[PDB]
Design a protein around this motif. Structure first.
Motif, PDB file in Angstrom:
ATOM      1  N   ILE A  11      24.465  65.652 -14.275  1.00  0.00           N
ATOM      2  CA  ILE A  11      25.269  64.441 -14.579  1.00  0.00           C
ATOM      3  C   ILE A  11      24.947  63.312 -13.579  1.00  0.00           C
ATOM      4  CG2 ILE A  11      27.373  65.015 -13.251  1.00  0.00           C
ATOM      5  CD1 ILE A  11      27.228  63.525 -16.713  1.00  0.00           C
ATOM      6  N   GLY A  12      24.577  63.627 -12.338  1.00  0.00           N
ATOM      7  CA  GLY A  12      24.252  62.573 -11.363  1.00  0.00           C
ATOM      8  C   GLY A  12      22.966  61.898 -11.684  1.00  0.00           C
ATOM      9  N   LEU A  13      22.074  62.550 -12.441  1.00  0.00           N
ATOM     10  CA  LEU A  13      20.854  61.884 -12.902  1.00  0.00           C
ATOM     11  C   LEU A  13      21.115  61.157 -14.215  1.00  0.00           C
ATOM     12  CD1 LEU A  13      18.052  64.495 -12.171  1.00  0.00           C
ATOM     13  CD2 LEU A  13      18.584  62.484 -10.887  1.00  0.00           C
ATOM     14  N   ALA A  14      21.991  61.657 -15.065  1.00  0.00           N
ATOM     15  CA  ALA A  14      22.186  61.137 -16.431  1.00  0.00           C
ATOM     16  C   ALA A  14      23.134  59.982 -16.383  1.00  0.00           C
ATOM     17  CB  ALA A  14      22.700  62.207 -17.350  1.00  0.00           C
ATOM     18  N   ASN A  15      24.077  59.950 -15.460  1.00  0.00           N
ATOM     19  CA  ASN A  15      25.106  58.906 -15.407  1.00  0.00           C
ATOM     20  C   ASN A  15      25.381  58.559 -13.945  1.00  0.00           C
ATOM     21  OD1 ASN A  15      26.864  57.027 -16.439  1.00  0.00           O
ATOM     22  ND2 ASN A  15      28.580  58.455 -15.987  1.00  0.00           N
ATOM     23  N   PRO A  16      24.418  57.947 -13.244  1.00  0.00           N
ATOM     24  CA  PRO A  16      24.653  57.504 -11.881  1.00  0.00           C
ATOM     25  C   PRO A  16      25.468  56.207 -11.915  1.00  0.00           C
ATOM     26  CG  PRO A  16      22.434  56.957 -12.492  1.00  0.00           C
ATOM     27  CD  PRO A  16      23.075  57.602 -13.714  1.00  0.00           C
ATOM     28  N   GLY A  17      25.946  55.813 -10.755  1.00  0.00           N
ATOM     29  CA  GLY A  17      26.630  54.512 -10.703  1.00  0.00           C
ATOM     30  C   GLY A  17      25.711  53.386 -11.106  1.00  0.00           C
TER      31      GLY A  17
ATOM     32  N   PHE B 132      22.832  68.609  -5.382  1.00  0.00           N
ATOM     33  CA  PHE B 132      22.657  67.600  -6.425  1.00  0.00           C
ATOM     34  C   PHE B 132      21.507  68.021  -7.333  1.00  0.00           C
ATOM     35  CE2 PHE B 132      22.862  63.237  -7.935  1.00  0.00           C
ATOM     36  CZ  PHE B 132      21.625  63.108  -8.519  1.00  0.00           C
ATOM     37  N   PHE B 133      20.392  68.448  -6.731  1.00  0.00           N
ATOM     38  CA  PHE B 133      19.164  68.693  -7.499  1.00  0.00           C
ATOM     39  C   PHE B 133      19.138  70.055  -8.137  1.00  0.00           C
ATOM     40  CE2 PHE B 133      17.302  65.063  -5.015  1.00  0.00           C
ATOM     41  CZ  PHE B 133      16.917  64.325  -6.091  1.00  0.00           C
ATOM     42  N   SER B 134      19.817  71.047  -7.650  1.00  0.00           N
ATOM     43  CA  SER B 134      19.622  72.390  -8.144  1.00  0.00           C
ATOM     44  C   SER B 134      20.270  72.576  -9.522  1.00  0.00           C
ATOM     45  CB  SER B 134      20.185  73.375  -7.209  1.00  0.00           C
ATOM     46  OG  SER B 134      20.034  74.675  -7.776  1.00  0.00           O
TER      47      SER B 134
ATOM     48  N   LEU C 288      22.255  52.101  -2.626  1.00  0.00           N
ATOM     49  CA  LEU C 288      21.904  52.871  -1.430  1.00  0.00           C
ATOM     50  C   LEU C 288      21.633  54.298  -1.838  1.00  0.00           C
ATOM     51  CD1 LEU C 288      23.053  50.483   0.167  1.00  0.00           C
ATOM     52  CD2 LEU C 288      23.933  52.209   1.784  1.00  0.00           C
ATOM     53  N   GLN C 289      22.448  54.876  -2.691  1.00  0.00           N
ATOM     54  CA  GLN C 289      22.214  56.273  -3.107  1.00  0.00           C
ATOM     55  C   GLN C 289      20.879  56.351  -3.851  1.00  0.00           C
ATOM     56  OE1 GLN C 289      24.200  59.461  -6.046  1.00  0.00           O
ATOM     57  NE2 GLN C 289      25.484  58.692  -4.406  1.00  0.00           N
ATOM     58  N   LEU C 290      20.601  55.418  -4.744  1.00  0.00           N
ATOM     59  CA  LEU C 290      19.330  55.368  -5.481  1.00  0.00           C
ATOM     60  C   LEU C 290      18.187  55.284  -4.469  1.00  0.00           C
ATOM     61  CD1 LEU C 290      17.248  54.469  -7.687  1.00  0.00           C
ATOM     62  CD2 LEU C 290      18.266  52.181  -7.497  1.00  0.00           C
TER      63      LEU C 290
ATOM     64  N   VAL D 192      17.977  56.042  -1.174  1.00  0.00           N
ATOM     65  CA  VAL D 192      17.817  57.180  -0.254  1.00  0.00           C
ATOM     66  C   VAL D 192      17.269  58.298  -1.057  1.00  0.00           C
ATOM     67  CG1 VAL D 192      19.058  58.863   1.158  1.00  0.00           C
ATOM     68  CG2 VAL D 192      19.572  56.451   1.362  1.00  0.00           C
ATOM     69  N   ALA D 193      17.767  58.610  -2.242  1.00  0.00           N
ATOM     70  CA  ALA D 193      17.324  59.731  -3.055  1.00  0.00           C
ATOM     71  C   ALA D 193      15.884  59.496  -3.517  1.00  0.00           C
ATOM     72  CB  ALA D 193      18.234  59.922  -4.209  1.00  0.00           C
ATOM     73  N   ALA D 194      15.620  58.399  -4.222  1.00  0.00           N
ATOM     74  CA  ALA D 194      14.280  58.096  -4.787  1.00  0.00           C
ATOM     75  C   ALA D 194      13.299  58.063  -3.635  1.00  0.00           C
ATOM     76  CB  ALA D 194      14.310  56.769  -5.515  1.00  0.00           C
ATOM     77  N   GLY D 195      13.626  57.494  -2.515  1.00  0.00           N
ATOM     78  CA  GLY D 195      12.637  57.295  -1.439  1.00  0.00           C
ATOM     79  C   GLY D 195      12.271  58.562  -0.716  1.00  0.00           C
TER      80      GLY D 195
ATOM     81  N   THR E 208      13.748  68.210 -12.956  1.00  0.00           N
ATOM     82  CA  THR E 208      13.118  66.895 -13.041  1.00  0.00           C
ATOM     83  C   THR E 208      12.045  66.694 -11.955  1.00  0.00           C
ATOM     84  OG1 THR E 208      14.779  65.792 -11.686  1.00  0.00           O
ATOM     85  CG2 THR E 208      15.095  65.790 -14.056  1.00  0.00           C
ATOM     86  N   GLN E 209      12.021  67.528 -10.920  1.00  0.00           N
ATOM     87  CA  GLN E 209      11.144  67.282  -9.751  1.00  0.00           C
ATOM     88  C   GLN E 209      10.211  68.454  -9.592  1.00  0.00           C
ATOM     89  OE1 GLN E 209      13.238  64.214 -10.056  1.00  0.00           O
ATOM     90  NE2 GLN E 209      11.660  64.106  -8.443  1.00  0.00           N
ATOM     91  N   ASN E 210       9.062  68.158  -9.000  1.00  0.00           N
ATOM     92  CA  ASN E 210       8.044  69.186  -8.724  1.00  0.00           C
ATOM     93  C   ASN E 210       8.076  69.440  -7.239  1.00  0.00           C
ATOM     94  OD1 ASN E 210       5.743  70.757  -8.607  1.00  0.00           O
ATOM     95  ND2 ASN E 210       4.388  69.082  -9.282  1.00  0.00           N
TER      96      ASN E 210
HETATM   97  C1  TES Z   1      19.942  59.073  -9.683  1.00  0.00           C
HETATM   98  C2  TES Z   1      19.271  58.771  -8.347  1.00  0.00           C
HETATM   99  C3  TES Z   1      18.449  57.512  -8.431  1.00  0.00           C
HETATM  100  C4  TES Z   1      17.178  57.685  -9.258  1.00  0.00           C
HETATM  101  C5  TES Z   1      16.302  58.850  -8.777  1.00  0.00           C
HETATM  102  C6  TES Z   1      17.122  60.145  -8.644  1.00  0.00           C
HETATM  103  C7  TES Z   1      16.292  61.270  -8.045  1.00  0.00           C
HETATM  104  C8  TES Z   1      15.093  61.548  -8.945  1.00  0.00           C
HETATM  105  C9  TES Z   1      14.271  60.308  -9.190  1.00  0.00           C
HETATM  106  C10 TES Z   1      12.942  60.345  -9.071  1.00  0.00           C
HETATM  107  C11 TES Z   1      12.029  59.320  -9.512  1.00  0.00           C
HETATM  108  O1  TES Z   1      10.813  59.438  -9.486  1.00  0.00           O
HETATM  109  C12 TES Z   1      12.632  58.049  -9.956  1.00  0.00           C
HETATM  110  C13 TES Z   1      14.056  57.841  -9.432  1.00  0.00           C
HETATM  111  C14 TES Z   1      15.001  59.040  -9.626  1.00  0.00           C
HETATM  112  C15 TES Z   1      15.311  59.217 -11.114  1.00  0.00           C
HETATM  113  C16 TES Z   1      18.335  59.851  -7.773  1.00  0.00           C
HETATM  114  C17 TES Z   1      19.298  60.976  -7.385  1.00  0.00           C
HETATM  115  C18 TES Z   1      20.576  60.250  -6.911  1.00  0.00           C
HETATM  116  C19 TES Z   1      20.364  58.756  -7.234  1.00  0.00           C
HETATM  117  O2  TES Z   1      21.623  58.136  -7.575  1.00  0.00           O
END
Ligand code: TES
Ligand code: HEM
Length: 400
Positions: free
Chosen positions: A78-84, A170-172, A229-231, A233-236, A388-390
């Motif tokens: 749900i945190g990937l499908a409906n983030p803020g 979050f990811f598992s 900020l959450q986007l 920190v997570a994406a980066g 979603t991640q490798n």
């Molecule tokens: C949804 C999210 C922002 C978008 C991120 C997501 C983690 C996975 C991800 C990988 C990508 O390659 C693109 C951005 C996304 C899709 C992040 C986890 C928490 C953050 O709110």
């Protein structure tokens, strides 16, 4: 109806799953872990078309299944499908509003200003490696991108251990439903405390700059800065870590190509770009919704249905890269640049930063440890149950 591929929540055999997704494409019917049916685009050319199609939007109000109450609030995804609300979840005007300042902070010139700091941190992390065999993920590939993004966003380093525990949940796919919402609430809390701090005591970080820009309206609300900020920190961190891990794995499993790069016959950018195509950190991106029926190959993506972009599978599309698409080859020429950073308005604004981080980390590592290799057979490496991640559980390396 359709052949429907249930994506493995444990990511046991990503190569086979990616191949199956290509076979079923360009528009494959899939089942996400938790039993949610969606479509996946699994071919390169069709993904580029859908990534620039104005009928394929981020607006979750277009999602039929969402409106019908079919999506559990404690779904682990749900945190990937409906983030803020952030640049991630909008298009058009609101996307430009919510993206501009962040993207401007990550241009090539602005990233080049971070080179010295990234290089100093890379070298310090190499200096701290202890023992003949290390988990190079935990000790090197994980901390570098997390420290970089935390510094960029004004996150207190003292919070990084707890953020690491929350992102693991979050990811598992295996996080118990009863822990899903609490994890999201605590993650949002850390970002909110960071925003409150940088409003009171502004610094030279990007969060401070977002706040100072949104003072006289028309820019981001505090809630949008928190989600941004959450986007960031997570994406980066999540992706860049896997880029560095996968590059080391790919060079270790292709020692003739490693020899080319170490002798200067191939350049480090070729390793990073081929790792991104062959073994992208991001297997799938959630989520887009069709406002109208959209033909994709000989199928129709119906209005109100959902689309994930299967970057992992389409990276090895033989229509884009030829009959060697399924192999790692840093010497390749392709008529088609990879799209592992996306395409169209939502293309990754962090691409230059990720390329600098990997482009500093990888030569620094092999300059220090020219004989480094895997400490286990490659077949013993294991994906984490992150659909979603490798991402690997660990990267055991004998440093030499
Ligand atoms: C949804 C999210 C922002 C978008 C991120 C997501 C983690 C996975 C991800 C990988 C990508 O390659 C693109 C951005 C996304 C899709 C992040 C986890 C928490 C953050 O709110
Ligand atoms: C190898 C590393 C990375 C990969 C593979 C990657 C991949 C992607 C992809 C594929 C998208 C677009 C998804 C889509 O629209 O379908 C994206 C978006 C995004 N990425 Fe990256 N990313 C990486 C690194 C980073 C870094 C280092 C940052 C930040 C510092 C970052 C920030 C973001 C943001 C903010 C978005 C959303 C953009 C928008 O929707 O307008 N990424 N990334």
């Amino acid at each position: 109806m359709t052949t429907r591929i249930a994506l493995d929540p444990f990511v046991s055999d990503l190569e086979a799953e990616s191949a199956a997704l290509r076979a079923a494409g360009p528009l494959a019917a899939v089942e996400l872990p938790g039993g949610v049916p969606v479509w996946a685009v699994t071919h390169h050319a069709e993904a580029k078309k859908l990534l620039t199609d104005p009928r394929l939007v981020k607006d979750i109000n277009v999602w039929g299944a969402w409106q019908r109450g079919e999506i559990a609030p404690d779904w682990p995804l749900i945190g990937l499908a409906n983030p803020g609300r952030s640049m991630l979840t909008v298009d058009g005007a609101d996307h430009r509003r919510m993206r501009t300042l962040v993207a401007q902070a990550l241009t090539p010139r602005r990233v080049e200003q971070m080179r010295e700091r990234i290089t100093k941190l890379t070298e310090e992390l190499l200096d701290r490696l202890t023992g003949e065999v290390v988990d190079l993920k935990a000790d090197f590939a994980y901390p570098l991108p997390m420290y970089v993004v935390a510094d960029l966003m004004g996150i207190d380093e003292a919070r990084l251990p707890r953020l690491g525990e929350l992102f693991e949940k979050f990811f598992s796919t295996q996080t118990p439903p009863a822990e899903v919402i609490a994890t999201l609430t605590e993650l949002a809390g850390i970002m909110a405390e960071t925003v409150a701090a940088k409003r009171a005591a502004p610094g030279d970080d990007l969060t401070s700059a977002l706040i100072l820009a949104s003072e006289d309206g028309d820019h981001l609300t505090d809630a949008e800065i928190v989600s941004t900020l959450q986007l960031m920190v997570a994406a980066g961190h999540e992706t860049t870590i896997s880029l560095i891990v996968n590059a080391v794995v790919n060079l270790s499993t292709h020692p003739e190509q490693r020899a080319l790069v170490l002798s200067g016959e191939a350049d480090w950018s070729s390793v990073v770009e081929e790792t991104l195509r062959y073994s992208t950190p991001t297997s799938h991106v959630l989520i887009r919704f069709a406002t109208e029926d959209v033909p994709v190959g000989d199928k129709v993506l119906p209005a109100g249905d959902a689309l994930i972009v299967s970057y992992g599978a389409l990276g090895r599309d033989e229509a884009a890269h030829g009959p060697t698409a399924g192999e790692f080859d840093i010497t390749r020429s392709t008529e088609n640049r990879h799209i592992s950073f996306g395409h169209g308005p939502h293309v990754c604004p962090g691409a230059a930063l990720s390329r600098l981080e990997a482009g500093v980390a990888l030569p620094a590592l092999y300059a220090r440890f020219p004989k480094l290799d895997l400490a286990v057979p490659a077949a013993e490496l294991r994906n984490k149950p992150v659909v979603t991640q490798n991402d690997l559980f660990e990267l055991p390396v004998r440093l030499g």
